[PDB]
Design a protein around this ligand. Sequence first.
Ligand SMILES: [Mg+2]
Ligand SMILES: [Mg+2]
Ligand SMILES: [Mg+2]
Ligand SMILES: [Mg+2]
Ligand SMILES: [Mg+2]
Ligand SMILES: [Mg+2]
Ligand SMILES: [Mg+2]
Ligand SMILES: [Mg+2]
Ligand SMILES: [Mg+2]
Ligand SMILES: [Mg+2]
Ligand SMILES: [Mg+2]
Ligand SMILES: [Mg+2]
Ligand SMILES: [Mg+2]
Ligand SMILES: [Mg+2]
Ligand SMILES: [Mg+2]
Ligand SMILES: [Mg+2]
Ligand SMILES: [Mg+2]
Ligand SMILES: [Mg+2]
Ligand SMILES: [Mg+2]
Ligand SMILES: [Mg+2]
Ligand SMILES: [Mg+2]
Ligand SMILES: [Mg+2]
Ligand SMILES: [Mg+2]
Ligand SMILES: [Mg+2]
Ligand SMILES: [Mg+2]
Ligand SMILES: [Mg+2]
Ligand SMILES: [Mg+2]
Ligand SMILES: [Mg+2]
Ligand SMILES: [Mg+2]
Ligand SMILES: [Mg+2]
Ligand SMILES: [Mg+2]
Ligand SMILES: [Mg+2]
Ligand SMILES: [Mg+2]
Ligand SMILES: [Mg+2]
Ligand SMILES: [Mg+2]
Ligand SMILES: [Mg+2]
Ligand SMILES: [Mg+2]
Ligand SMILES: [Mg+2]
Ligand SMILES: [Mg+2]
Ligand SMILES: [Mg+2]
Ligand SMILES: [Mg+2]
Ligand SMILES: [Mg+2]
Ligand SMILES: [Mg+2]
Ligand SMILES: [Mg+2]
Ligand SMILES: [Mg+2]
Ligand SMILES: [Mg+2]
Ligand SMILES: [Mg+2]
Ligand SMILES: [Mg+2]
Ligand SMILES: [Mg+2]
Ligand SMILES: [Mg+2]
Ligand SMILES: [Mg+2]
Ligand SMILES: [Mg+2]
Ligand SMILES: [Mg+2]
Ligand SMILES: [Mg+2]
Ligand SMILES: [Mg+2]
Ligand SMILES: [Mg+2]
Ligand SMILES: [Mg+2]
Ligand SMILES: [Mg+2]
Ligand SMILES: [Mg+2]
Ligand SMILES: [Mg+2]
Ligand SMILES: [Mg+2]
Ligand SMILES: [Zn+2]
Ligand SMILES: [Zn+2]
Lengths: 91, 22, 77, 112, 50, 251, 63
Amino acid sequence: AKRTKKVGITGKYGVRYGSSLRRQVKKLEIQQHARYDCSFCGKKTVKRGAAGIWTCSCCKKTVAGGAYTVSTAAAATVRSTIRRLREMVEA
Amino acid sequence: MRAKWRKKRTRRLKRKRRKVRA
Amino acid sequence: AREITDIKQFLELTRRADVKTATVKINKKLNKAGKPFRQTKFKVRGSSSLYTLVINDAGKAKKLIQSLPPTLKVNRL
Amino acid sequence: AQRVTFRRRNPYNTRSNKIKVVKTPGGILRAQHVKKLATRPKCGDCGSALQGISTLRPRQYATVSKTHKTVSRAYGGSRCANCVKERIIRAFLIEEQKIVKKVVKEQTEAAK
Amino acid sequence: AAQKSFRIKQKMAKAKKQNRPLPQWIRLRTNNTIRYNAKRRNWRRTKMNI
Amino acid sequence: GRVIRNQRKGAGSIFTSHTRLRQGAAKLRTLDYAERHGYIRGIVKQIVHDSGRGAPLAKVVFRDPYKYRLREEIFIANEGVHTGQFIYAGKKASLNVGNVLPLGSVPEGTIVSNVEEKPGDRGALARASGNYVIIIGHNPDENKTRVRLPSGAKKVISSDARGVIGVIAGGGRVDKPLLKAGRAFHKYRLKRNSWPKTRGVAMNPVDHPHGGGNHQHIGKASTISRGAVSGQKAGLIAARRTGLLRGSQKT
Amino acid sequence: AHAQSKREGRHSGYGKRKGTREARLPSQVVWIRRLRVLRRLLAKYRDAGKIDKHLYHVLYKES
RNA sequence: GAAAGGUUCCACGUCAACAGCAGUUGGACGUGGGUUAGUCGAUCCUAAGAGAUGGGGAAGCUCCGUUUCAAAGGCCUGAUUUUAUGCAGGCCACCAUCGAAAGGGAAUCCGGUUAAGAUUCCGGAACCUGGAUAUGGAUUCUUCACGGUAACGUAACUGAAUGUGGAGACGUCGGCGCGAGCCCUGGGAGGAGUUAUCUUUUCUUCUUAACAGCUUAUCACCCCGGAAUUGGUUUAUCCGGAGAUGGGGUCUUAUGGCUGGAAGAGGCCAGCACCUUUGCUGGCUCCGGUGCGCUUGUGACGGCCCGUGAAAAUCCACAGGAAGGAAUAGUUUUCAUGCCAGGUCGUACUGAUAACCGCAGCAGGUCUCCAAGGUGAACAGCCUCUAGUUGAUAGAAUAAUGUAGAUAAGGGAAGUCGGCAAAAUAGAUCCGUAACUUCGGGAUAAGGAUUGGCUCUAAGGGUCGGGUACGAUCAACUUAGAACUGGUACGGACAAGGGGAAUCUGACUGUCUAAUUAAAACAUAGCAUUGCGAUGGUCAGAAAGUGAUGUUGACGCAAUGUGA
RNA sequence: AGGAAACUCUGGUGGAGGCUCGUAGCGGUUCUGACGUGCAAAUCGAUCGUCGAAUUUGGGUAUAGGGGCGAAAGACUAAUC
Ligand SMILES: [Mg+2]
Ligand SMILES: [Mg+2]
Ligand SMILES: [Mg+2]
Ligand SMILES: [Mg+2]
Ligand SMILES: [Mg+2]
Ligand SMILES: [Mg+2]
Ligand SMILES: [Mg+2]
Ligand SMILES: [Mg+2]
Ligand SMILES: [Mg+2]
Ligand SMILES: [Mg+2]
Ligand SMILES: [Mg+2]
Ligand SMILES: [Mg+2]
Ligand SMILES: [Mg+2]
Ligand SMILES: [Mg+2]
Ligand SMILES: [Mg+2]
Ligand SMILES: [Mg+2]
Ligand SMILES: [Mg+2]
Ligand SMILES: [Mg+2]
Ligand SMILES: [Mg+2]
Ligand SMILES: [Mg+2]
Ligand SMILES: [Mg+2]
Ligand SMILES: [Mg+2]
Ligand SMILES: [Mg+2]
Ligand SMILES: [Mg+2]
Ligand SMILES: [Mg+2]
Ligand SMILES: [Mg+2]
Ligand SMILES: [Mg+2]
Ligand SMILES: [Mg+2]
Ligand SMILES: [Mg+2]
Ligand SMILES: [Mg+2]
Ligand SMILES: [Mg+2]
Ligand SMILES: [Mg+2]
Ligand SMILES: [Mg+2]
Ligand SMILES: [Mg+2]
Ligand SMILES: [Mg+2]
Ligand SMILES: [Mg+2]
Ligand SMILES: [Mg+2]
Ligand SMILES: [Mg+2]
Ligand SMILES: [Mg+2]
Ligand SMILES: [Mg+2]
Ligand SMILES: [Mg+2]
Ligand SMILES: [Mg+2]
Ligand SMILES: [Mg+2]
Ligand SMILES: [Mg+2]
Ligand SMILES: [Mg+2]
Ligand SMILES: [Mg+2]
Ligand SMILES: [Mg+2]
Ligand SMILES: [Mg+2]
Ligand SMILES: [Mg+2]
Ligand SMILES: [Mg+2]
Ligand SMILES: [Mg+2]
Ligand SMILES: [Mg+2]
Ligand SMILES: [Mg+2]
Ligand SMILES: [Mg+2]
Ligand SMILES: [Mg+2]
Ligand SMILES: [Mg+2]
Ligand SMILES: [Mg+2]
Ligand SMILES: [Mg+2]
Ligand SMILES: [Mg+2]
Ligand SMILES: [Mg+2]
Ligand SMILES: [Mg+2]
Ligand SMILES: [Zn+2]
Ligand SMILES: [Zn+2]
């Protein structure tokens, strides 16, 4: 059954530290404990080892990523503009 | 080891050829 | 501290020019519940290891004892 | 219900002071100090345990023969079989690719 | 301690050799002033501090 | 009065950085010949965690051009670098994430990191997690590039300076609350002895300028002149302003 | 004699229990015994051919 | 056993002093004896760190710095056979040293033995390192092995410089599997105890080391094959066209089994004996079973981190192909056997209500290993076995006042600054559980009932069994219910929450005034501000060619305030 | 199991937490108990706080006097601050 209404993974913290802080650590702990799609092997095997290190259990590849997500939006847009500038330097 | 072992090996081979020289 | 399972390896062992002593040990064993037999162990004391040969037939045991070299110091117990 | 003692002067539960209780032919219990357990050698590329290789402490490998330390392949006791296979494939394939790159980059500017 | 150094054991040996009473023929020498061993040391009363 | 705590910090007895579990200084490869006349290729063998550092490190292996051997440089891993990836470092290197192009050979708006101040110091700028340096513009004459730093400052460095293309990995770390003195303890336990911090106003006047009084109060103004001396600089050093920052700072 | 009477079932009422039911016997190990029994029986039946793999799978899941 | 002590250890003699009484006794006094190592440690390695040298400071005692603004050295092959070791060569660039008796690390076990020593001595059985070396075996006229599709196998089955890789080498917690020892238990062979009565009964012995050979495994890997009707599968849900299940194999040998070691040892008994050294002679030492058991080791996993949880010595392997090599002969000593040596220091004893520190033979303090049975959730409390003590000045009486422990009719906080102290409550099962809330809690809320013994009943399992539904057998403590029974007693001793309504204050966990204040004080997470882009900020230093932050770079460092 | 869907609900499994009761341990609230020419220049007894970590602790090592160290009491720095 559904054990908790809204605290989720932050039920391990009990009543401590305040609800508005528990909400932030909930939204970030879900991300850092989620599994992700490996862009090399195609499987849902990528897990965080430490902050910034995301390794695939299947293909044993290790990607440098965000502290709690495998890729940040800033890194995504930097990759996009770097691709565009690389495409522009020939033209 | 492997270094003193190789040196012992060459010492034994040198002694064998030097005693069979005669 | 080793075991030998061939009588002719034991024979080529007991004339190895560093073997000095051997010991023939007699044991009372029971292969099944009705047959108490007499096992012999021939232990040659080499310079680094003790080689044991186990024989369960008294005829092969005594024939091996006759075939033992005379210069070897044997100990019967 | 017998109780044992350390047989050395180390009174502490460190990794080099691991004991195991054994029963002697005297019928008594006695501690017996066991050395630390060995780790299997690992592949240089994939980091998995190399099969065919004996599991010993590093000084004990000086006492065994070459059979216990190797297999009968290139990169025998060093790399995994699949790692050897994929590096062979990579070598042959990209040397062929280097050849075809050589001939096409030669012939384009030879024409021009 | 049991695992001790040779220097400590040598000082302990010298102290063991020194821990003795007078030879009683010394009180018979002429112009003798020594009655007893004033430098006597026991392990329960004073420590060597070594 | 005593010698105060921030005054004692410079002796470096118990205030040194705990460097037992660090993989080494994360520096760039030396600008020998290949990096300034062409490129050179290395391979990312492993991306590892460094103690006391929020950003992950990357162990890149190059070949020595003059001796038959392998050199292992420790880069700060940029976001997107994976194991087995080929890193290209040099003047003729292609503009990709992880490459170590000089700043003269990148267009405007390029996002770089681990940037050299002067060519040869092997990475000084934008090395913390999630930080990066933007290239604003170039000056071919007077060969300098203007860059925007993470602080918002604008520097003018040599165009021969190098930088790793991309963003330093481990970003968004400080967006999570630590929630616990234990977590702060374990964070600082591998950096240095700078935690916890006793307020100077809760000390005695022998221990701090702010100490003493029948109520906990600072007394004089907490803004300290830059020309003050050691033992006095406890507070806001050379504050141009103070209080809550409303509006843009006119950067 | 006390162990014989306990095996037979005496000295086990509420006045002789000082620990909780979970402390006397964990519900986890009870569940483990149950699941091992069910999985062992299902594998035995499947390898004997009395059930097919498609029935075995749903029985495994709902067990 | 570690630190510490140092002869306190053991024997003989002994009681003047000490053992706050005594003393014939003693850790006392006097006289002697006692500590045996190639394998246990130190020695070796490096950690935090200390610290010469080259240099640079300082009037100087000396300071900095430890690879630096240094011309910082040694390694193998040989060649020569006036010959010594130069010259022939070739390689190499770390760059003192010290620093762990708990880190890393070459190698030893059993039995016996002394008044006091033993993993050290005796006997037996092994192993490692270093060095010499000969024989056998292996290999070669296809010179430097063959077999297997493969994973890989073997008794061996050249391999320099150089390079690469691995081991050494690693957190913590949870549960699960397996192993060892212990616990429990059946049969049998012995001995002992109880026996008014009962008890095929109670207790005890039935053991097998290091090392060696054969075999033995989760994981992992290989071959065939090609999977949706998706399958396999863990306690815990992950895996599969990047090739599952399935069939067949390969491997690590932790570990376990058999054999050797090794029954000759040790143990338990019986009989014969004799001033006696005292033995001598016989037997038996066997076969099992169980488990959420305790302790411990290990494996495969899983959880946690803005924490990802030493280094070096040391050893091995691989890539490479230098050089040397056979046919009347060799080449090999990572295979077997065989020979020699293994130094120096420690080793006794206590390790604490008497061997250490506290002025002492002080209720204080002082690191760690082993850990039986019953009750019971439990290394709780209580009782017992093995082992160890029976030590602390005693005797006689039983006044007051004390200290410690208790009990009290009726009332029930009227006592007192104040319910201080004490009492009450208490375990387990079932029922029931409010305001408020940050929705997680509050909560064991509050508040009730039951609990013994005996005789039964029910449910909950394993292993074997089927041409090409069931039966047999073995063994668990878990829960529920029902009668019956008793001076209504039953968590019967032990053990074990008092609760509620509010206010002030601090968010919480945490920390401090050792020896009068543990708190509302400090800290904290969170919040906010300030300085700084390295020719820099903050700080140190007498100076320095000096340092800390910094193995750092604004998601950072430094300085403050406030305190979820 | 419900629902048109979004998704909701029930029963299990699992075993998180600077959670909790409570040993060893660490500490030292109250009796303002004992003692107070003591066993003791800080102890004893009961009652207590905490007990998986911001834990406890051995050894090694670093910081030395207007200095050190200090989760800050002017606390500690060999019964000395
Ligand atoms: Mg092999
Ligand atoms: Mg093998
Ligand atoms: Mg601190
Ligand atoms: Mg503060
Ligand atoms: Mg104050
Ligand atoms: Mg002042
Ligand atoms: Mg003030
Ligand atoms: Mg005040
Ligand atoms: Mg019942
Ligand atoms: Mg239990
Ligand atoms: Mg459960
Ligand atoms: Mg007296
Ligand atoms: Mg007297
Ligand atoms: Mg004595
Ligand atoms: Mg110096
Ligand atoms: Mg040393
Ligand atoms: Mg050592
Ligand atoms: Mg050690
Ligand atoms: Mg270690
Ligand atoms: Mg002894
Ligand atoms: Mg001997
Ligand atoms: Mg062969
Ligand atoms: Mg390693
Ligand atoms: Mg783990
Ligand atoms: Mg055996
Ligand atoms: Mg051994
Ligand atoms: Mg398969
Ligand atoms: Mg073994
Ligand atoms: Mg333990
Ligand atoms: Mg000794
Ligand atoms: Mg001893
Ligand atoms: Mg002792
Ligand atoms: Mg002790
Ligand atoms: Mg003791
Ligand atoms: Mg004393
Ligand atoms: Mg003293
Ligand atoms: Mg214990
Ligand atoms: Mg029980
Ligand atoms: Mg108990
Ligand atoms: Mg007394
Ligand atoms: Mg009354
Ligand atoms: Mg009242
Ligand atoms: Mg009143
Ligand atoms: Mg009154
Ligand atoms: Mg009043
Ligand atoms: Mg009270
Ligand atoms: Mg309440
Ligand atoms: Mg508080
Ligand atoms: Mg106080
Ligand atoms: Mg107090
Ligand atoms: Mg405060
Ligand atoms: Mg600076
Ligand atoms: Mg302010
Ligand atoms: Mg807690
Ligand atoms: Mg608690
Ligand atoms: Mg306690
Ligand atoms: Mg007290
Ligand atoms: Mg008092
Ligand atoms: Mg008094
Ligand atoms: Mg004050
Ligand atoms: Mg003091
Ligand atoms: Zn992948
Ligand atoms: Zn591999």
